[PDB]
Amino acid sequence: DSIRILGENIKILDRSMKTMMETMKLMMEKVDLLYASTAVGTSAPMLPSHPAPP
Amino acid sequence: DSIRILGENIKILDRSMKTMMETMKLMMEKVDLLYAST
Amino acid sequence: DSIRILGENIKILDRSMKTMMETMKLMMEKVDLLYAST
Amino acid sequence: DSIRILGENIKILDRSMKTMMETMKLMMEKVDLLYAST
């Protein structure tokens, strides 16, 4: 039982992480579209938005 | 093997959080240069 | 025994996350209505 | 050795969380002053 009392804890830690995922992804949608909207007609480079494949 | 698999899961959770690090750090220049335009 | 001391540290850890959680939400709204009021 | 490495893992998690916090406080003010900019 002592192994599952924290097993749920890990899940809620994971769930908080998953909620964190969506939270910024909404930020990343907005920020990207701001930058893209200001790119038309300019030489603005293509800054990445994801670090790299594993 | 529950302990080993949960250790692996928390490891991949660490890696995802380092990806969180790099993405947020990556937005830095994107927002910053946006100021520089103005 | 030694597993007891690694429990409460998670308790405060989550309370740090919870205390962190509203930090996003209270700024979720303020970064949201930035976009509409634009 | 599993418990020891698990403890080191928790420690690196806590320090990475300190890094998250300090980079956020390096974020919140800069994002907020954009409101004063508009």
Binding site: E22, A52 | - | Y35 | -
Partner: protein
């Protein structure tokens, strides 16, 4: 080489001519300026010139063509045996080719083609003046000068090509129109076509208005049709266009066409390319394109919000589909605030219906990873000729240096050669695609390098838009990204979208389309036709970013899709308009808003073609759901059809109005402003797959379709035949297609070959009749697939055609040899055979190029510098393929069908597919072939020389007489040398000889097939419906191995070979005729002989169609008798002993008795079939599709199984199922009736009375139940479980658990094992009560219940008195009476059926013994129209037996108590007083033994029915009145036996009181339902049972309620 095109394939650009006119200083300009006249027109008005071209009449001698076409059509039709239509066909061809206007158009086409040929692919820069009648064409480099008169129209070569294509299209249109009109009820509509041509050619309006008119012709015609014929939903589509305000003559002509026939109007209006194409106004077109790629119809905030909503609905649909396909939710993470309903549904792995209306609840559901992005596309997508730009630095290679210099004053810094390839195949060859995951890595990051951020827009050719539509050519990296994304979406995501998923499964599409066709006519499902115009230049990043993010998460490809969703904002766009280049600042294009544009909101046409489809389905579903309608969104392109079903409370008009309002609202939110110009609702016209459908029936595409490497005659003819074959595959009639194809083929031959060949009528005919199967040019004639749909051997057809030609026409066999020039190859080429099972082993001289497969492979293997190619060609694939084919050649009983099957599922087959896909690319062939100009000249010279030699080929005399089946067998024997067998299939026309039943002899009827027309057919019926009906190779090999083991082949060679394949993969352990067919009831009663049968059926229907279209009419049924006996081979499959051990090795570098089991399976299969049938309503029963294809079975196979086993299995399944009242009631009502794949097919299986008496359940049950017809006995037998538990629970004892476990996935497997169990039972012949002069009166008489009892007995007694041996019975006689007469021994019955077996079929169905089948002569009965000798049924005539009913019974016959009739024969009375009853023996079931002399048997039946009625009363909602009537019949019999009076009417009160059945004549409870039964009469059969001592025994032990009902108070 200059002028390297023979057909229009590029947009009609005009900038080049403008540049050369005023600018430019090249030498050609000096000559060009010299030849222009004072009134020099502009290229934009080129069509205004070519319309004035007139040729002198009768310039090209073609009468030879007319005669040759006549002969060819005559020969083809005569071979098909539809001779009577030869007149129509060849008269139509002659009329088409003799009309002055048509001939003028044809000559113009010929002149244009000759001119094109003489200049195209030439090396000379300039070609002297060429006369085109009154024109004076002159060619300079790539420019053309037209000088009809003192007027000049200097134009580009593409303009001249467009003019030539227009002339050719008009020729096709005219010929097709004439032929088509010749085969109608409303024929001869050519005049209207010519009038339209003149009207259009008389238009002098400006360029833009003219092309607007031409473009609007078709939508305006659709609007005209809809407005007049819409019945429920209004329409205004016609009013939107400006044709009447611009060209009134055209409007009047179109309205006249509508008044004539809507289908004609739609067909004529379909053509949209027989009118000159426009010169795209690049200056304005490009500007508007760029502007439309950056306009914002909605604020990005609203677009993002609506994108979130679309993400919600997308999640909902995906979850629904996944649950429906896997019964479990995907891996999802519920955000905080998730609705408890979603949580519960996820926990239970279900899908509550409430979600569909509450998609918003899914905003809190996030889908986790479900798969991984397949960053390794298969070669099929990569190997393509789609043009691409290697990188940014190549942008300077899409413009003319001189024009750039003249437009800016500075040179264009082009490097000497392009920095990379120009087409995707070249890129793959160069090794640039060997590391795709690394190539797409920047996309994963989201930072596509600068070098791959350029797109070149290309105007699209052959489109009637003045401002043109541009399709984008992307960089190599972007193309690979597009391919990967499209593959991922179409494979892992798109299928799971439930609502959209039912838009690509052809089964679902076909079912939905059939439902729409059947439902639209009456009107309960109108269709909304969405047609987005700005779709391609639509979607903005905001709208799609949410779904992009969701997809990214689902595929665990971080910021991959979103990369493409925001990419175009950082892309440079340039218009591919040479002679108008953008300025070059630092080696990069500079934005100007006309030629170049840096960054745009959309990515342009041809990108994310799937994602946009998903989004469109999403918002359409959102729009329609909120108005609570029933939609079936259908379509994939910018045009989509929405099907809306009728609502029970709103007329279709209001429903359509609300749907249109909702769609407008919910498409505006998506930045896709929708206009009335592209939205119409109708219940008459609906378009899908570029095919109009008027009132359900498809609109013929004859007019349109028939109007559609280095050049060569073979390629042109092949394209012609393929186009005509596709048109025929469409609803286009085969005859119009064939005639038009023959005419066009003759024209094409006329264009190329010299006069020495053309002016030889016999040679031209023979050449046109020699197909490719025998080694000739592809011709429309030799195409058996024109009419049929499935595979067909072409060789017998070719031989039959040649045979008919030799027999009829004056052509001699020597000429056939001369034309054919058979040349058997020196050595067998097994690879070709395995690729084409039906082909001969001959040298295809006219093939443009053979053995090029090795040449392509060798060129690819070397000069590659790649990695994927190297590992894909590490040794010659062709050699290994030849080795594998030679290995497969050892099949002792050669079966090239199997070889092709076995060869197909091998890696080398995939390799050959890749190689010949490489060959498909245009210039990669030139890369291997390294110029063509000589080849084209060489090829022509070769064929021209070919058709001169008088030297014969292999003598064909022996292979032209006799049956063509034997001829094909012998030919294959000769051309391969070891007796190929198993693929030749007969030619239906030879196999069957249609005949009219009006005149036909018995010898003609022995073997034949019946065709019964329900009513007189005519031209109306032809167009109106009637009433009558990867690793996957692993799975393929597994199923094939099962299919083999079950055939019982267990050969070590095959086992090892298949295991080798599996370890290589890693495993280790019609349409055109159905409409008419619906008016034909079909039968087969010869029992001789798959897929080829469908060919025979289609041939019969074709005979009907021909005899109608020839002006005739069919009233009497017709036949298709068997003619060529030798064509009926007796097939007996043998083993595939491979003989020599297989040597192919492997590649690995590419990429209890079955009767019981079957009987139990049949029982359960039938049980579930009934279970699904009961659910279906009246509107869902017309479909004959049983649960799982229960129909494709023979009759003998079923009769092999002991029917007792099946009956027990079905009974056990039924009792085990134990359905509640509703289903039981549905079964009872429908089984007493008969509908659908139900008791119908049961009765279909149970004609043979042998099964009935031999059915163990029935014989025991026969004395227990009473029936009235064979259609009631079977129903009682199959309903026994729920009516008579007394016996069913006795036979339920038999059971076996392992039999239950027998899965149905292998249902056909047990049938095959039981194919040859033994021999079916016999029929026996049970007797009827006979009479003799000296006999004993036993009192038994057949048909006791029937009123015709006395009549039937009198006829029997008369027959026996007359000692007749042969008797004729007309259909007028009572069916029961004839049956009784049939049962008489030592008598032959000849029904006067006149070729209609309905009456005879009825007699068989009623009878329960073999008397009818044994004593009724079928060959004579179907061949008899009037009686010959003694007959019954006529009121008068020689030998006619007549019964005159006596007014008063004046005689008491010893056998018949009252003689109610007097027998007369040819006006002479027949004395029958001395006749007496014959000793009776085992009687037939027609005597109704179930109720026998033994009253205890009647007691058993009465008690059983009483119990059944009591059980029925407990069934709520069941109409019990029908059953009570049969029970009352037994009650009347019992009352007669007891002596009680037989009341005419009796009132019964029925109901459930205190949970018990009640059936009482007196109402003792208010809840009892009163039911009155009238017409009750005492049954004379009950008289025999009315024994005085038998009265008491009846009531002993009977139920009190039954006793009360029997006794009348």
């Amino acid at each position: 080489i200059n002028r390297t095109d023979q057909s229009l394939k590029n947009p009609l650009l005009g900038t080049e001519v403008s540049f050369c006119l005023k600018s430019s200083s090249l030498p050609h300009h000096v000559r060009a300026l010299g030849q222009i006249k004072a009134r020099n027109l502009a290229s934009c008005d080129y069509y205004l010139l070519f319309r004035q071209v007139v040729l002198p009449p009768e310039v090209y001698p073609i009468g030879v063509l007319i005669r040759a076409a006549e002969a060819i059509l005559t020969v083809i039709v005569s071979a098909w045996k539809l001779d009577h239509m030869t007149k129509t066909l060849y008269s139509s061809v002659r009329y088409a080719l003799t009309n002055p206007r048509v001939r003028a158009q044809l000559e113009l086409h010929i002149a244009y083609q000759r001119i094109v040929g003489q200049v195209s692919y030439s090396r000379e820069a300039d070609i002297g003046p060429k006369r085109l009648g009154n024109m004076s064409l002159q060619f300079i480099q790539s420019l053309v000068i037209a000088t009809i008169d003192t007027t000049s129209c200097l134009m580009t070569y593409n303009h001249f090509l467009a003019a030539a294509d227009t002339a050719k299209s008009r020729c096709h249109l005219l010929i097709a129109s004439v032929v088509q009109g010749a085969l109608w009820e409303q024929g001869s509509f050519l005049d209207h076509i010519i009038n339209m041509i003149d009207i259009i050619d008389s238009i002098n309006l400006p360029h833009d208005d003219y092309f607007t008119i031409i473009k609007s012709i078709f939508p305006y015609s659709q609007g005209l049709v809809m407005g007049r014929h819409n019945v429920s939903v209004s329409s205004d589509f016609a009013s939107v266009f400006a044709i009447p305000e611009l060209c009134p003559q055209l409007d009047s002509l179109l309205k006249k066409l509508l008044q004539l026939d809507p289908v004609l109007l739609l067909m004529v209006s379909s053509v949209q390319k027989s009118w000159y194409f426009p010169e795209i106004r690049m200056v304005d077109g490009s500007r508007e394109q760029l502007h439309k790629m950056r306009v914002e119809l909605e604020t990005p905030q609203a677009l993002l919000s609506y994108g979130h909503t679309l993400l919600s609905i997308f999640r909902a649909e995906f979850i629904k589909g996944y649950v429906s396909k896997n019964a479990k939710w995907p891996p999802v993470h519920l955000l905080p605030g998730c609705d408890k309903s979603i949580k519960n549904a996820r926990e239970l792995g279900r899908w509550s219906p409430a979600f569909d209306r509450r998609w918003q609840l899914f905003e809190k559901v996030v889908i986790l990873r479900i798969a991984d992005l397949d960053m390794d596309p298969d070669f099929n997508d990569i190997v393509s000729d789609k043009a691409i730009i290697s990188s940014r630095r190549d942008w300077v290679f899409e413009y003319n240096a001189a024009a750039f210099w003249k437009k800016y004053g500075e040179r264009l810094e082009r490097p000497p050669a392009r920095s990379g390839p120009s087409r995707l195949v070249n890129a793959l060859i160069d090794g640039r695609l060997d590391n795709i995951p690394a190539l797409l890595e920047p996309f994963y990051r989201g930072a596509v390098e600068f070098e791959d951020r350029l797109t070149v827009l290309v105007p699209k050719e052959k489109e009637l838009k003045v401002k043109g539509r541009f399709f984008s050519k992307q960089t190599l990296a972007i193309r690979i990204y597009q391919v990967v994304a499209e593959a991922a979406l179409k494979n892992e995501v798109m299928p799971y979208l439930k609502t959209h998923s039912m838009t690509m499964s052809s089964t679902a599409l076909t079912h939905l389309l059939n439902r729409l066709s059947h439902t639209i006519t009456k009107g309960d499902s109108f269709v909304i036709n969405l047609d987005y115009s700005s779709w391609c230049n639509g979607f903005r990043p905001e709208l799609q970013a949410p779904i992009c993010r969701q997809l990214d998460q689902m595929f665990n490809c971080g910021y991959f899709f979103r990369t493409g969703c925001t990419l175009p904002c950082f892309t440079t766009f340039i218009i591919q308009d040479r002679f108008n280049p953008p300025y070059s600042l630092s080696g990069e294009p500079v934005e100007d808003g006309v030629t170049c544009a840096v960054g745009t909101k959309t990515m342009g046409e041809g990108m994310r073609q799937k994602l946009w489809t998903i989004l469109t389905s999403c918002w359409e579903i959102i729009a329609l759901r909120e108005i609570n309608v029933t939609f079936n969104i259908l379509g994939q392109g910018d045009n989509q059809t929405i099907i809306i079903h009728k609502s029970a409370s709103q007329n279709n008009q209001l429903l359509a109005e609300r749907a249109l309002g909702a769609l407008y609202k919910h498409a505006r939110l998506a930045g896709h402003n929708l206009k009335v110009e592209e939205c119409w609702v109708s219940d008459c016209l609906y378009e899908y797959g570029k095919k109009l459908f008027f009132r359900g029936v498809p609109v013929p595409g004859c007019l349109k379709q028939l109007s559609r490497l280095f050049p060569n005659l073979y390629s042109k003819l092949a394209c012609l035949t393929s186009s005509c074959l596709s048109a025929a595959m469409a609803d286009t009639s085969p005859w119009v297609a064939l005639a038009t194809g023959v005419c066009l083929y003759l024209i094409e031959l006329y264009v190329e070959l010299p006069p020495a060949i053309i002016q030889d009528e016999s040679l031209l005919t023979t050449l046109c009749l020699v197909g490719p199967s025998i080694g000739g040019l592809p011709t429309p004639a030799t195409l058996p697939s024109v009419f049929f749909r499935g595979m067909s051997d072409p060789l017998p057809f070719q031989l039959a055609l040649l045979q008919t030609l030799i027999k009829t026409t004056g052509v001699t066999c020597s000429l056939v040899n001369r034309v054919v020039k058979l040349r058997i190859a020196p050595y067998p080429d097994w690879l070709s055979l395995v690729t084409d099972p039906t082909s001969l082993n001959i040298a295809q001289v006219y093939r443009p190029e053979r053995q090029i497969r090795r040449w392509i492979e060798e060129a690819i293997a070397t000069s590659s510098h790649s990695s994927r190619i190297a590992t894909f060609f590490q040794q010659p694939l062709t050699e290994m393929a030849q080795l594998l084919a030679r290995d497969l050649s050892t099949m002792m009983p050669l079966r090239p069908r199997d070889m092709s099957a076995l060869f197909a599922l091998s890696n080398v087959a995939y390799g050959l597919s890749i190689i010949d896909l490489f060959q498909k690319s245009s210039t990669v062939v030139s890369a291997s072939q390294a110029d063509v100009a000589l080849e084209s000249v060489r090829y022509k010279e070769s064929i021209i020389q070919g058709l001169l030699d008088t030297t014969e080929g292999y003598n064909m005399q022996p292979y032209l007489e006799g049956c063509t089946y034997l001829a094909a067998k012998q030919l294959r024997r000769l051309t391969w040398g070891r007796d190929l067998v198993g693929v030749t299939m007969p030619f239906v026309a030879e196999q069957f000889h249609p005949h009219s039943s009006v005149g036909a002899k018995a010898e003609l009827y022995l073997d034949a097939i019946i065709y019964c027309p329900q009513e007189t057919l005519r031209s109306h019926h032809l167009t109106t419906r009637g009433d009558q009906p990867a690793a996957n190779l692993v799975k393929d090999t597994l199923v094939l191995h099962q299919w083999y083991k079950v055939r019982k082949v267990t050969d070590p060679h095959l086992n090892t070979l298949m295991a080798r394949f599996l370890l290589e993969k890693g495993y280790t352990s019609t349409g055109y005729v159905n409409i008419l067919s619906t008016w034909l009831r079909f039968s087969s009663d010869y029992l001789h002989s798959t897929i080829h049968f469908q060919h025979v059926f289609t041939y019969g229907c074709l005979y009907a169609d021909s005899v109608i279209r020839s002006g005739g009419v069919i009233s009497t049924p017709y036949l298709l008798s068997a003619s060529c006996k030798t064509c009926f081979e007796k097939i007996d499959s043998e083993e595939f002993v491979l003989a020599c051990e297989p040597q192919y090795r492997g590649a690995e570098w590419l990429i209890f008795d079955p009767c019981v089991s079957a009987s139990y399976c049949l029982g359960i299969l039938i049980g579930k079939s009934f279970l699904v049938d009961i659910r279906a309503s009246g509107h869902d029963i017309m479909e004959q599709r049983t649960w799982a294809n229960l129909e494709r079975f023979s009759v003998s196979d079923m009769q092999k199984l002991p029917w007792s086993i099946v009956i027990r299995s079905l009974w056990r399944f039924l009792i085990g199922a134990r359905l509640l009242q509703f289903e039981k009631a549905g079964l009872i009502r429908m089984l007493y009736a008969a509908t659908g794949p139900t008791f119908s097919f049961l009765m279909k299986v149970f004609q043979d009375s042998a099964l009935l008496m031999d059915c163990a359940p029935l014989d025991r049950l026969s004395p227990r139940i009473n029936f009235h017809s064979r259609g009631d006995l079977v129903a009682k037998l199959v309903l026994l479980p729920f009516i008579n538990p007394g016996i069913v629970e006795i036979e339920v004892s038999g059971i076996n658990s392992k039999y239950h476990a027998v899965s149905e996935a292998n249902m056909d497997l047990y049938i095959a094992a039981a194919k040859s169990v033994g021999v079916k039972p016999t029929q026996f012949v049970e007797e009827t009560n006979d009479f003799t002069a000296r006999g004993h009166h036993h009192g038994c008489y057949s048909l006791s219940w029937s009123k015709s009892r006395n009549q039937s007995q009198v006829l029997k007694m008369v027959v026996r008195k007359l000692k007749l041996c042969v008797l004729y019975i007309y259909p007028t006689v009572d069916p029961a009476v004839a049956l009784d007469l049939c049962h008489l021994p030592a008598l032959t019955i000849i029904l006067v059926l006149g070729g209609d077996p309905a009456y005879y079929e009825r007699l068989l169905e009623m009878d329960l013994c073999g008397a009818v089948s044994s004593r009724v002569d079928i060959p004579h009965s179907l061949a008899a129209r009037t009686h010959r000798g003694f007959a019954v049924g006529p009121d008068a005539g020689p030998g006619v037996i007549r019964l005159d009913r006596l007014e008063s019974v004046c005689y008491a016959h010893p056998c018949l108590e009252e003689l109610e009739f007097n027998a007369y024969l040819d006006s002479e009375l027949v004395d029958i007083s001395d006749m007496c009853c014959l000793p009776l023996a085992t009687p037939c079931k027609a005597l109704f033994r179930p109720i026998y002399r033994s009253l205890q048997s009647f007691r058993l039946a009465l008690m059983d029915n009483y119990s059944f009625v009591m059980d029925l009363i407990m069934i709520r909602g069941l109409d019990i009145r029908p059953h009570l009537e049969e029970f009352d019949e037994l009650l009347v019999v019992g009352q007669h036996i007891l002596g009680q009076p037989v009341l005419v009417e009796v009132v019964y009160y029925v109901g459930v009181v205190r949970k018990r059945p009640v059936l009482a004549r007196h109402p003792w409870s208010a809840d009892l339902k009163r039911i009155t039964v009238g017409g009750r009469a005492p049954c004379p059969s009950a008289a025999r049972l009315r024994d005085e001592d038998c009265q008491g025994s009846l009531l002993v032990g009977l139920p009190a309620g039954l006793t009360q009902l029997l006794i009348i108070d």
